[PDB]
Amino acid sequence: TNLPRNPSMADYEARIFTFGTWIYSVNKEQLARAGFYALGEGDKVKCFHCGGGLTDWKPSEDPWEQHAKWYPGCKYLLEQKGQEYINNIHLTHSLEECL
Ligand SMILES: CC[C@H](NC)C(=O)N[C@@H]1C(=O)N2[C@@H](CC[C@@H]1CO)CC[C@H]2C(=O)NCc1ccc(C(C)(C)C)cc1
């Protein structure tokens, strides 16, 4: 049902390879472990499983967190971090708006 959108990038090694020319603050090993691979069009990266694309990284920012924040539907994310992790990121935002 929920098959990788890009099965060619399903291996960690495939993904890190893409970060050859990586010159940006955010750690390429962390991006890769969170399912992303670089597009060589700035700091743009894309999730191999959900196909979600992300840009304009700041130095502090966590790939996993951003993955959940923007693309919580990903099956890879769910297998790797679980329901609670994803829902936690979203409830956190709701509490911020509430108080
Ligand atoms: C990476 C964290 C960063 N920190 C501000 C950030 O939140 N970026 C976001 C961010 O990158 N976002 C979100 C909205 C904008 C924000 C602010 O830019 C949701 C879509 C995503 C976004 O604009 N992605 C650009 C993008 C979309 C698609 C693609 C493709 C088509 C997968 C190749 C590449 C790049």
Ligand SMILES: [Zn+2]
């Ligand atoms: Zn994903």
